[PDB]
Amino acid sequence: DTVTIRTRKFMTNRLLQRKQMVIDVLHPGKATVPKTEIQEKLAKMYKTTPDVIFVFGFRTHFGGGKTTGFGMIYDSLDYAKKNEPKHRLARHGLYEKKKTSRKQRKERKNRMKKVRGTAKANVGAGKKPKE
Amino acid sequence: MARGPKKHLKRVAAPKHWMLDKLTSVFAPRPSTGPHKLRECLPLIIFLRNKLKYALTGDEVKKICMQRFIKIDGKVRADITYPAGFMDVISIDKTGENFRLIYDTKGRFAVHRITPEEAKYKLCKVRKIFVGTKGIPHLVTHDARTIRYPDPLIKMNDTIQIDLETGKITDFIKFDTGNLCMVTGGANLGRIGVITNRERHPGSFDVVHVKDANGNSFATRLSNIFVIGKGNKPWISLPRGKGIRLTIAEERDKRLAAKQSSG
């Protein structure tokens, strides 16, 4: 309600093909309308659709009535996918990282050391203990 | 122990004039091996994402470099922590903007856009001028570029317009009294000025009496003086903060006056 997105520190970034900016959202008394709302709202300003817009940061300001965050708008989805930090993709789901996770890989790596050749053998050796 | 050289450098142990933070990050970028020594260098990353702010992760920095949109000294680099130094020109080929690094007299590396005319060449002072093997002469510049068959009248502390299109010497400027110099390092960091007199002492360490533009006079060691061209004839412009020398009071007056007066 009664937001307005005011863009400090605007950057035309031609070499990562994106408009990079701070998002300053005034509110009447309660800090922060949704991240999804902000991407939609911003989307019709620069006319790029919200699906090439990512928004991150965000931290409510005491006594309400403001929230400063950060946004990026990619000219195309290809550009977004190519600068691409995993956490940014994660933030509103559409890709998340590995879920193997971690100690499975370490066990596997220790199995490979034992013998020379025979890939499949070491997989099966890692797989029998669950313990 | 200590069984070999470190491949890491911690932050809060890196040189001040790179303008990194205190303890909010536990590792500094660290320069790669290259033509300049690591104290005076400025890793590519600090320029690219801390001054020009094109990345907010390290993941992006690697991805930027692999585009190969960045040439440094006319030649195509892809190193994440390139050891750029004094009067090294960075050429962004995607935007047509050439930036060179020269000290503020504050002591902070300047973001100093130059025209692509002035980014054709850089002036490099000779470090040694070498009679090489089989009686072929070479000059060697500070930035470790060896150019064979150099002009046959040159002598030490001359400057040399190196060209970056084609390499090699593209004339030279002779070392003489009253030449422009920028005094680099020490307590005389980033000051510009003439010479006046170079005092010679046999054995190690010879001091060069410098007078700056303001008319403040000081000496430094010859080592700390870098010749940047011919007297009263710049080849690149003065950077921000004067680049000469300014007092802490004057500097405060500028800081408060300009702020809340722009926009």
Next chain:
Amino acid sequence: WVCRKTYVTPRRPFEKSRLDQELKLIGEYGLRNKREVWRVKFTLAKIRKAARELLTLDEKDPRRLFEGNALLRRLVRIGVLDEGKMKLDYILGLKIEDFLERRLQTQVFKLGLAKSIHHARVLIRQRHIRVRKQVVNIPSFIVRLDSQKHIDFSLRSPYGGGRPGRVKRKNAKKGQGGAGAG
């Protein structure tokens, strides 16, 4: 990283007359305890030592000039000191009171919605004011000159205007549950 105390403990623990003095300051300026008084004692002693050092430096010396002017400017910004005086000699003459008087609590008394040096502190701590459009919850604060021109009710205390919390609504339901009988 690094940390430091903001108060000081004197060398005599019982010194009756002084204890009374400190209690009187607490009464006058609405403070929590002796630690509040000690907090000002620590700051004031450092200011006097700063001043005294400068004053024994040679005149027309960059360090004395630059830091002198800075010390003066800071003390005038917070309205402790006046710039019709404006040198080291006068800074020495300042005392604990002069600081306390420029606090947020004592301004909230002098204008606005407090009735006492009691009331004021509780009002600030319960977020009844904004200094500008910015809530302040700390009564020991020290406001600057032009920050005393913007002390006013908050929009998160719902008298003086603001969104209903659950304390206005509590009073409403002493008329609709106290006197509504349900």
Next chain:
RNA sequence: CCUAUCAACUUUCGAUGGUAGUCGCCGUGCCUACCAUGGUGACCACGGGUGACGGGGAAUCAGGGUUCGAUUCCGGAGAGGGAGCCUGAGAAACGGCUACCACAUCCAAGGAAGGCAGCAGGCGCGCAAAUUACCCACUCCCGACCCGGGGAGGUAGUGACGAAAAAUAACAAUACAGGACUCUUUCGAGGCCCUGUAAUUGGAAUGAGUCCACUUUAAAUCCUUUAACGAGGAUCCAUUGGAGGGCAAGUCUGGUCGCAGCAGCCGCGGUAAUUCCAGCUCCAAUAGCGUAUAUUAAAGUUGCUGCAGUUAAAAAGCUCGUAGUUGGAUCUUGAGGGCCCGCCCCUCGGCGCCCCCUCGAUGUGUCCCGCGGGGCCCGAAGCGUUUACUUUGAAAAAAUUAGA
């Protein structure tokens, strides 16, 4: 750093040096031949001790000083102890190797494999110190590489080392105890500001809890954001020591009666205990306070600044006297402006002399001159023979610290 209840020491298995060679990434008694007899000490060597890593730095001090430094950063050193070695530019490497020694493990008894002063964890030790967790997203490192791997490192958990903010109620009413003001001769009454103490209240407020939602973030947590909730009271309810003196606050009340205890110290208690043991009241500091202990301040009770020695603790029986410390007197440098400046009893600059392209008499080249390069050589100046000192510069880690 401490030590003389350590005064002579270093080489027969080189101690110092010359010469020549072997050897080493390379200097060198590194090692060896031959040849010399050196080298070092009262200015503390040599020897012994050391919870002796070093620095940047830390704590307290009026100043002077004193004390601390394994411990977020830099250098060095070691990875159970010793010795040897391979790979590689770099290692005498324990998440490499080989032997032995001390430890531990498996064994079918022939054998075989091992090093948490890595991260967690356990045992032991003690007065003393946390998760057998999650993640490579950040910060950087490595690789053939954006892509992978990281107990580097990030993240949470544990966390009254210690630091920061400062709540646990605030405002009226009335019932009273009070004072400026007014009226009254005063007594008395009215009167505003309230402080407490009743009786309860009246609105008025706020998170401690509780909680959709938005936010956080690797994904989460908590914070900072908020619909709906959360204060009339012995409560949503604070503590820890003290009250004889030093010492702040009991000429307390009951109990004990030199008993139990108190008591750093001085001293209380033996019957009318203001020190005890309880209660009550009060004081001090207040989400903290008590206690033990090291160290610092106070302490001019280690006295450099800045001690004392007739009698209080303290001038050798006396003199000579070397080191050591300390040391008498005595040499020259007028204008300008209303002090300030240079002076007196050859590499440069340049008064000049001679040279060259020559600068005006001239256009390999003069007679104004060394002016640009020279030589020689005056006011100037190495001047005469050295300094310590003091003064200006540089060289002079970041964090810290003062401080913008």
Next chain:
RNA sequence: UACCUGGUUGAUCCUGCCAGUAGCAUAUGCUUGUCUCAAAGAUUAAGCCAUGCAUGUCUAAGUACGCACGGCCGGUACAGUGAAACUGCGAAUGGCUCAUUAAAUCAGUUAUGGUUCCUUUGGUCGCUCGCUCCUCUCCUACUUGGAUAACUGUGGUAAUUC
């Protein structure tokens, strides 16, 4: 914040230490609501250690004859992708702890003209200068020689990253 105060006695003035007192750093007692910052197995055994884990690495691009997977696309060698393995590099760095050592370590200031240095960055990339051209016959240049892994099969060992 440059401080002192209590105790030798009949009383008094001194010398004097003792006790009080504040800082601080650990320990410990007791208590403890909310917000932020975080030091933390040094002391004492550089004691001993179960288990888990802390260093690995591929670009169109050194080297694919996977039991692979998928193709129509097949011969000259032919595949797109790719477990593996060889090759090259890291593994000396990182992290940890301060036992050891008294001009040793180390700090600051200097040196290497006494020496070694992968890598990166910049130069250096035809030749025997014709053996007075074997290199015009030394005529393999349209390119030489032959063996290991992974693989396939047979296996040994009470137990081995054998």
